[PDB]
Amino acid sequence: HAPKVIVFISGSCLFGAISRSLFKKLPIPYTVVLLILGAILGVVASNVPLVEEHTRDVAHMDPHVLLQIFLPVLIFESAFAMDVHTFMRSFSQVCILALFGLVVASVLTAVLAMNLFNYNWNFSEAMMFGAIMSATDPVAVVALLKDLGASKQLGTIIEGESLLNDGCAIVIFNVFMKMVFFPQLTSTVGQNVLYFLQVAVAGPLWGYAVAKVTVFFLSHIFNDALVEITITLAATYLTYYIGDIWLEVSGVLAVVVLGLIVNAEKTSISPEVEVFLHRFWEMLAYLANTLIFMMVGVVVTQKALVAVDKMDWFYLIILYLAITIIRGMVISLFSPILSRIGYGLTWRNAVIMTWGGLRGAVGLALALVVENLAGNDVIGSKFLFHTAGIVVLTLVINATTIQTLLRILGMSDISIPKRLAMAGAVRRIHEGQNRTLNMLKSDRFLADADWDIATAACEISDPYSADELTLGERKSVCPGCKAMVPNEPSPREFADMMEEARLRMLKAEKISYWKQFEHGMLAREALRLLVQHAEVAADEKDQFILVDDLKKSWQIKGIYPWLKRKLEDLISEKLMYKICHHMAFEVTINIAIVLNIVPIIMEFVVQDKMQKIEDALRISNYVFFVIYAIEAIVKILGLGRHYIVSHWNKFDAFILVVALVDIIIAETLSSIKVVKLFRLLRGLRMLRLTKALIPKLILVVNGKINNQLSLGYDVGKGYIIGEEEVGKIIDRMVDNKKILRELKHISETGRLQVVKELGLLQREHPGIAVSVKTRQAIRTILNHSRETIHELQGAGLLDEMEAHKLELTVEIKMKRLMNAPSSIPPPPPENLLKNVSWLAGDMKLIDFIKARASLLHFDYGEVIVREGDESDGLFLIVSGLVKLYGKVFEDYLTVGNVIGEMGVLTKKPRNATVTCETTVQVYFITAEDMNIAIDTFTLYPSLEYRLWRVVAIRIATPLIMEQMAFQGWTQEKVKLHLERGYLVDLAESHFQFNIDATLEDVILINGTAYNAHTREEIRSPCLISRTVHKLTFQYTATEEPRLFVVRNAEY
C-alpha cells in the first residue's frame, strides 16, 4: 500500500535532530541516546503492532542492501573528509600501523574469544568477531584534536588509521564470512592465493581506474554543478556495486581509493561544488549513522536481548577491558617501527590513540549482517549483543575520559603566541565595537535604540580567557616603548636581544606567508610548508629558515625525470613523403589498429570456445584487414631511408612478413597455425599500441613534473616575497644596529640563493617552467579581473545578474586553465622580443627593432656589462640567468628583463657589472640605433616615454614599498598602483609642476628639482613629500627631469 520506510527514516531524522540539539552541552555523544531511543522504539514495537509493522518492514532488512546502501556513503565520507597531503606525508606509518595492527588485533581478539567465551566458536568465527571488534570509527576524538590547537598531525594519523582500519576490517570480515556462512566451497592453494591477490590488488586498481575516469569527467564540466554532484554519488555507488557483485573484488578498498583520489585532486571541482560536496557527504554520512544506530537499537532489544545471561554481561566487561589492553599492546609493540618514521609517536599520542579507539557504525552494520545471516542460531544474537555493548561502552567511557585525558596529559593548553594573537584580535574587535557604538549613538534613525541590549548582544569575549615565570621572562625581554630607561647592552642581554629579534623575524615571516595566502598568491600546500619550516626554525636555538630545508620543495629529481628522458629518447626520431608529412595517415592506421584489435580478440574468444565455419574464419579476418590495408599501400610504396632507418618501421616489416606467413598458412588450409596466429595478433596489438601509448605517458609524466615544479616555484616565490616584505619592515622591530646588520646579511644571502636556484630550475626543464608560468600569469590576470568585477558590483555601476554572468565567464576560464597543457614549448627569441613591455603596442617599431637586433651568445663567467665602460648598447635576456654586482646591491636578472635603460638614456657610465651564471643569449641594440629609434617615433606612447616608464616603475616600486610597509600593501599591490600612473611632460607644463590633493604619490625618477619656493634644492630622486606644495623645474642639458605620479581612481 504505502511505504512505512519513509516514516521510519523521517522519524530517525527527527530523533537525530532532537538528539543533536538537546545534547550539545553534555559530553555524552548523540549516538548513545540514539541507541537508547532505538531500544525504546523497539520495545514499544514489541508491544504495539503498528510500530511492529514499521520496524519489521525496516529493521529486518536484507544484509546485502544494508551493505550496498550504507557502507559506500560512510567509506567515501571518511575518505573525503581527509587532509590528503598530511595523510600522504605519513602514509607509510598509517599503513603499517593500521594493517599490521588489524591483523594482530584480530587474531588476539579471536584467541581471546575462543579461550574466554563459553560458546564453542571455531577459529574463523572468532576472526569474524575480531574483525568486527577492531574496526574503529573515531569522530569525536578527531573533532577534539582539530579543535584543541596543536597536535594537528595526530588527528590525521588517527583518521587515516581509522579509514584503512575500516576498509581492511570489512575485507577480512567478508573473507571469514564467506568462510563461515557459506561453507560449500572447497579450494586448493592456487585458487586461495588467486582470491587473495584478486581482492588485495583488484580493489585498489578498480578504485584507481574509476577515480581516474571520474576525475577526467569532472575536469570537463563547466557551469553545471548538479551534474558534478550526481557523478560523484553515482561513481561511488557504481564503484562499490560493480566491485562487490560483478567483479567479485573488495569494493570497500575501491571506494577508499576513489575517495582518496577525489580528495587528492579537488581542483577540477568548482569551489562552490566542492564545499557543497563536503557538506553533502557529511550530511549523508550523518544520515547513515543515525539510521544504522536506530536499527541496531531496534534489533538489539527485539532479538539480541532475548538470549543474554549474567555471564554475557561479564564477558562484555572483560571483552572491553581486553580490547583496550590489546590495542595498547599493539601500539606499544609497534612503537619502535612507528618511531623510526619522520613523524615518530610519543607516549602521550600513543595513549591518546589507544583510548581513541571508538567503535562505530561500521562494526554495528557488520554485526547486523552476521545476525541476519545466522538465522535462528544464537551466534548472531551473541555477536549483536556484544557489538552493541562494546560500542556503547567505548562511546560513553572513551569520549568522556578522552576529554579528561586531553586535559590532564597537557595537550589541551593553548600556546602563548596563539593566546596573544587571540587577545589582540579580541581587543581590536572590542575597540571597533566601541567606535561603531559611538557612531550609532549619533545617527538620526538609530539614536533612540536601547543600548544596554546592544552591548549585551554585541559583546565578543576571548575564548581562551613555570608558565608564569616563562611569560614573565618573555615580557622581560622587551626594550620597547612601554618603558623609558636609557642604558647600555650586556652580553647576556645581547643574547636575549638576539633571540627576541630572531623570533620577531620568524613571526613576521609567518604573517608574510599568511598575507600571501589571503591575497590569492601562495598555494595552500606551499603555505603549509613555509609556515612549518618557520615554526621548526622557531623551536630551535639560533636556526633561521634555511635554504637547504627549502630546496626539497623544488627537488625535481625522481622517477619522473628519468621516465621523461628515456621516453624522449625512444620517440626522438630524426612524392610519397607528403602524405606522411600531413600526419593524417597515422591516425587512420591507429584507428585501423584498434578496429583490428577488438575482433581478433573476439576470434581468440571463439577458438577458445572451440558457426558457419566461424563466419568463414571471419572472412579470413577480413583477409587480415585486406592484409593490413595492403601493408599501408606497401608503406606508401617503400618511402626510402625514412622507412629504412626506423626500428618501428622494422617491426612493421616484421608485421608484414608474419602476415605473409598467415597467408601461406591459409594456403596450407592445425595446432601450430592457431598458436602462431595467437602470437601474430598479440604482438601486433602490443607493439602497435606502444606508439600511441608512449606520448600519453609523456604527458602524464609531464603533468607530475608540472605539479612538483608548481609546488617548488610557489614555495620559492613565497619565501622571496615574504623575505622582501620582512626586510622592508625589519627596521621598526629591531632597534640595535649591529643586530640589524647581521639579520639583513642572512636575509640577503637566503634571498640570493633562492633566486639563483629558481633560475637554474627554469634552466633545467624549459617547457614545464614556461607552462607553470603561463598558468600562474593567467590565474593572476583572471583573479584581478574578478576583483574588478567585484568592485564594479560593489560600487553599484553593475547590477547583480550581469556581474554574475561575468563571474561565471571568469570561473569557466579558470576551470579551463585547470585543464592546461602540461608542457608549453618555449617561445622563440623573436617572440620574446615582441612581447616586451616597452615594445608591446607599435608594430612598426617592432619591425625596426627586429631589423636592428643581434643575438649575442656568452659562456659561463664572461662579463657582459662593465661599470667603467661608457654605454654603447641595450641588452635583452632571451634565455639564461645573469648575476649583478653593483655599488652594495646584488640581484639576479631573469629571462625577459632588459639591461641598460638609464645607460642608453642619460648617457652615463654603467652602474653595475653583469656576468653569466649560465650561458646566455642577449639582444644587443647598439646605442646609435637606439638613438635613431628614439628620434624616428613621435606617437603618444613613445619609446622614450615607454623605456622611462619601465625604469620609473623599477626605481619607484621599492621606494613606495618603504613608506607603505607600515600600511601593509604587498609588492603586487604597489606594482599595480604604480602601473596606473604616467610620466608627465614639463614642456606642456612649462617646467612648473603643481602638486594636487588628488595625487596619491609623486616620485621624481631622475634629475634635480627645486621645491617649496626654493626652500631647499632636492637633488636626490625620491618621493616628493606631501609637505611640498609645488615643484619648479629648471632646464639643464642632459639632465632630463622625470617625475612619475599616480592619480586617484574616479568612478
Ligand SMILES: Nc1ncnc2c1ncn2[C@@H]1O[C@@H]2COP(=O)(O)O[C@H]2[C@H]1O
Ligand atoms: N637596483 C636594481 N635592480 C635591478 N636591476 C638594476 C638595479 N640597478 C641597476 N640595474 C640594472 O643593471 C644595469 C647596469 O647598467 P645600467 O646602469 O646601464 O642599467 C642597469 C639596470 O638595467
